[PDB]
Amino acid sequence: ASRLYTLVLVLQPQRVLLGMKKRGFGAGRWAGFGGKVQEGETIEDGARRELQEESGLTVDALHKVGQIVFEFVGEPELMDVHVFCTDSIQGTPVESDEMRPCWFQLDQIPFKDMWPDDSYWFPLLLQKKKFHGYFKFQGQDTILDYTLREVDTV
Ligand SMILES: Nc1nc2ncccc2[nH]1
Protein backbone atom coordinates (compact mmCIF):
# COMPACT_ATOMS: atom_id res chain seq x y z
CA ALA A 1 0.00 0.00 0.00
CA SER A 2 2.20 2.83 -1.27
CA ARG A 3 1.74 5.70 -3.70
CA LEU A 4 4.51 7.06 -5.95
CA TYR A 5 5.76 10.64 -5.53
CA THR A 6 8.71 12.60 -6.89
CA LEU A 7 10.93 15.22 -5.29
CA VAL A 8 13.50 17.28 -7.23
CA LEU A 9 16.30 19.35 -5.69
CA VAL A 10 18.02 21.87 -7.96
CA LEU A 11 21.44 21.71 -6.29
CA GLN A 12 24.22 23.89 -7.67
CA PRO A 13 27.79 24.19 -6.33
CA GLN A 14 27.01 26.99 -3.84
CA ARG A 15 23.20 27.13 -3.60
CA VAL A 16 20.00 25.07 -3.67
CA LEU A 17 16.51 26.05 -4.85
CA LEU A 18 13.57 25.49 -2.50
CA GLY A 19 9.95 26.53 -2.84
CA MET A 20 7.59 27.77 -0.14
CA LYS A 21 4.36 25.85 -0.65
CA LYS A 22 1.37 28.17 -0.38
CA ARG A 23 -1.57 25.76 -0.14
CA GLY A 24 -2.42 22.13 0.43
CA PHE A 25 -0.40 19.44 2.14
CA GLY A 26 2.85 20.86 3.51
CA ALA A 27 1.88 24.51 3.07
CA GLY A 28 4.20 26.85 4.94
CA ARG A 29 7.37 24.77 4.55
CA TRP A 30 10.27 25.11 2.15
CA ALA A 31 10.62 22.01 -0.01
CA GLY A 32 11.86 20.63 -3.28
CA PHE A 33 9.52 20.30 -6.23
CA GLY A 34 7.46 17.24 -7.00
CA GLY A 35 4.17 15.45 -6.79
CA LYS A 36 2.25 12.38 -7.79
CA VAL A 37 3.29 10.17 -10.71
CA GLN A 38 0.61 9.68 -13.34
CA GLU A 39 -0.74 6.54 -14.99
CA GLY A 40 1.48 5.54 -17.89
CA GLU A 41 4.20 8.00 -16.88
CA THR A 42 7.69 7.05 -15.78
CA ILE A 43 8.87 8.26 -12.40
CA GLU A 44 11.60 10.38 -13.98
CA ASP A 45 9.16 11.90 -16.47
CA GLY A 46 6.86 12.72 -13.55
CA ALA A 47 9.73 14.38 -11.72
CA ARG A 48 10.58 16.51 -14.76
CA ARG A 49 6.92 17.45 -15.29
CA GLU A 50 6.41 18.48 -11.65
CA LEU A 51 9.59 20.57 -11.58
CA GLN A 52 8.18 22.55 -14.52
CA GLU A 53 4.67 22.83 -13.05
CA GLU A 54 5.85 24.04 -9.64
CA SER A 55 9.01 26.03 -10.42
CA GLY A 56 8.83 26.94 -14.11
CA LEU A 57 12.22 25.29 -14.71
CA THR A 58 13.13 22.86 -17.48
CA VAL A 59 15.45 19.98 -16.54
CA ASP A 60 16.99 17.45 -18.90
CA ALA A 61 18.81 14.64 -17.12
CA LEU A 62 17.74 13.99 -13.55
CA HIS A 63 20.01 12.01 -11.26
CA LYS A 64 18.54 9.53 -8.80
CA VAL A 65 19.68 10.38 -5.29
CA GLY A 66 17.29 8.70 -2.88
CA GLN A 67 14.10 6.93 -1.93
CA ILE A 68 12.18 7.97 1.19
CA VAL A 69 9.05 6.20 2.42
CA PHE A 70 6.75 8.27 4.63
CA GLU A 71 4.21 6.73 7.00
CA PHE A 72 1.60 8.82 8.82
CA VAL A 73 0.09 6.90 11.72
CA GLY A 74 -3.58 6.22 11.10
CA GLU A 75 -3.27 6.76 7.34
CA PRO A 76 -3.30 3.66 5.15
CA GLU A 77 -1.20 4.81 2.20
CA LEU A 78 2.58 5.09 2.46
CA MET A 79 4.24 7.81 0.40
CA ASP A 80 7.03 6.34 -1.75
CA VAL A 81 9.08 9.43 -2.63
CA HIS A 82 11.69 9.13 -5.37
CA VAL A 83 14.25 11.93 -4.88
CA PHE A 84 16.29 13.40 -7.74
CA CYS A 85 18.84 16.16 -8.14
CA THR A 86 20.03 18.31 -11.00
CA ASP A 87 22.52 21.12 -11.39
CA SER A 88 21.66 22.08 -15.01
CA ILE A 89 18.33 23.87 -15.50
CA GLN A 90 16.80 26.23 -18.04
CA GLY A 91 14.43 29.06 -17.32
CA THR A 92 14.28 31.19 -14.23
CA PRO A 93 12.27 30.24 -11.12
CA VAL A 94 8.62 31.29 -11.31
CA GLU A 95 6.52 32.32 -8.32
CA SER A 96 2.92 31.18 -8.70
CA ASP A 97 -0.23 30.83 -6.61
CA GLU A 98 1.06 27.47 -5.40
CA MET A 99 4.79 27.98 -4.85
CA ARG A 100 7.30 30.74 -4.00
CA PRO A 101 10.83 29.65 -5.06
CA CYS A 102 13.97 31.03 -3.44
CA TRP A 103 17.68 30.21 -3.67
CA PHE A 104 19.52 29.34 -0.45
CA GLN A 105 23.22 29.34 0.19
CA LEU A 106 24.21 25.88 1.38
CA ASP A 107 25.08 27.18 4.86
CA GLN A 108 21.67 28.88 5.17
CA ILE A 109 19.28 26.00 4.45
CA PRO A 110 16.11 26.83 6.47
CA PHE A 111 15.70 23.55 8.34
CA LYS A 112 13.42 25.05 11.01
CA ASP A 113 10.92 25.90 8.24
CA MET A 114 11.25 22.54 6.44
CA TRP A 115 9.84 19.06 7.01
CA PRO A 116 11.71 17.68 10.04
CA ASP A 117 13.08 14.68 8.12
CA ASP A 118 15.15 17.01 5.93
CA SER A 119 17.63 17.59 8.75
CA TYR A 120 18.52 13.90 8.45
CA TRP A 121 18.94 13.34 4.71
CA PHE A 122 19.62 16.80 3.27
CA PRO A 123 23.24 16.62 4.58
CA LEU A 124 23.69 13.40 2.60
CA LEU A 125 22.32 15.06 -0.54
CA LEU A 126 24.71 17.99 -0.10
CA GLN A 127 27.68 15.60 -0.02
CA LYS A 128 26.49 13.73 -3.14
CA LYS A 129 25.53 10.59 -1.23
CA LYS A 130 22.60 8.35 -2.13
CA PHE A 131 20.17 7.01 0.45
CA HIS A 132 17.14 4.94 1.42
CA GLY A 133 15.04 6.37 4.22
CA TYR A 134 11.86 5.60 6.12
CA PHE A 135 10.15 8.11 8.42
CA LYS A 136 7.12 7.36 10.62
CA PHE A 137 5.25 10.57 11.49
CA GLN A 138 2.54 11.42 13.98
CA GLY A 139 0.91 14.44 12.46
CA GLN A 140 3.15 16.69 10.41
CA ASP A 141 5.69 17.68 13.10
CA THR A 142 6.72 14.58 15.06
CA ILE A 143 9.02 11.82 13.83
CA LEU A 144 8.18 8.76 15.91
CA ASP A 145 10.78 6.47 14.30
CA TYR A 146 13.02 6.46 11.27
CA THR A 147 15.67 4.56 9.39
CA LEU A 148 18.20 6.05 7.00
CA ARG A 149 21.12 4.40 5.25
CA GLU A 150 23.45 5.31 2.44
CA VAL A 151 23.29 3.14 -0.68
CA ASP A 152 25.30 2.69 -3.86
CA THR A 153 22.16 2.13 -5.98
CA VAL A 154 18.95 4.02 -5.39
N1 LIG B 1 10.69 16.43 3.11
C1 LIG B 1 9.38 15.86 3.20
N2 LIG B 1 8.47 15.93 2.22
C2 LIG B 1 7.35 15.29 2.67
N3 LIG B 1 6.16 15.07 2.07
C3 LIG B 1 5.21 14.39 2.70
C4 LIG B 1 5.41 13.90 3.99
C5 LIG B 1 6.62 14.11 4.63
C6 LIG B 1 7.62 14.83 3.93
N4 LIG B 1 8.88 15.20 4.23
UniProtKB/Swiss-Prot annotation:
Changing V154A: Slightly reduces 2-oxo-dATPase and 8-oxo-dGTPase activities and increases thermolability. 2-oxo-dATP binds at T6, A31, F33, G34, G35, K36, W115, P116, D117, D118. Widely expressed with highest expression in thymus, testis, embryo and proliferating blood lymphocytes. Keywords: Cytoplasm, Hydrolase, Magnesium, Metal-binding, Mitochondrion, Nucleus, RNA-binding, Transit peptide. A motif (Nudix box) lies at residues 35-56. Changing E53G: Loss of activity. It catalyses: 2-oxo-dATP + H2O = 2-oxo-dAMP + diphosphate + H(+); 2-oxo-ATP + H2O = 2-oxo-AMP + diphosphate + H(+); 8-oxo-dGTP + H2O = 8-oxo-dGMP + diphosphate + H(+); 8-oxo-dATP + H2O = 8-oxo-dAMP + diphosphate + H(+). O(6)-methyl-dGMP binds at T6, K21, A31, W115, P116, D117, D118. InterPro entries: 8ODP (IPR003563), Nudix_hydrolase (IPR020476), NUDIX_hydrolase-like_dom_sf (IPR015797), NUDIX_hydrolase_CS (IPR020084), NUDIX_hydrolase_dom (IPR000086). The N-terminus is blocked. Binds 2 Mg(2+) ion per subunit. One of its GO terms (molecular function) is 2-hydroxy-dATP hydrolase activity. 8-oxo-ATP binds at F25, F33, G34, G35, K36, E50, E54, W115, P116, D117, D118. Changing A47P: Loss of activity. Mg(2+) 2 binds at E50, E53. It is an enzyme of class 3 (hydrolase). Changing Q52P: Loss of activity. Changing E150A: Reduces 2-oxo-dATPase and 8-oxo-dGTPase activities and increases thermolability. N(6)-methyl-AMP binds at T6, K21, W115, P116, D117, D118. Belongs to the Nudix hydrolase family. This is Oxidized purine nucleoside triphosphate hydrolase.
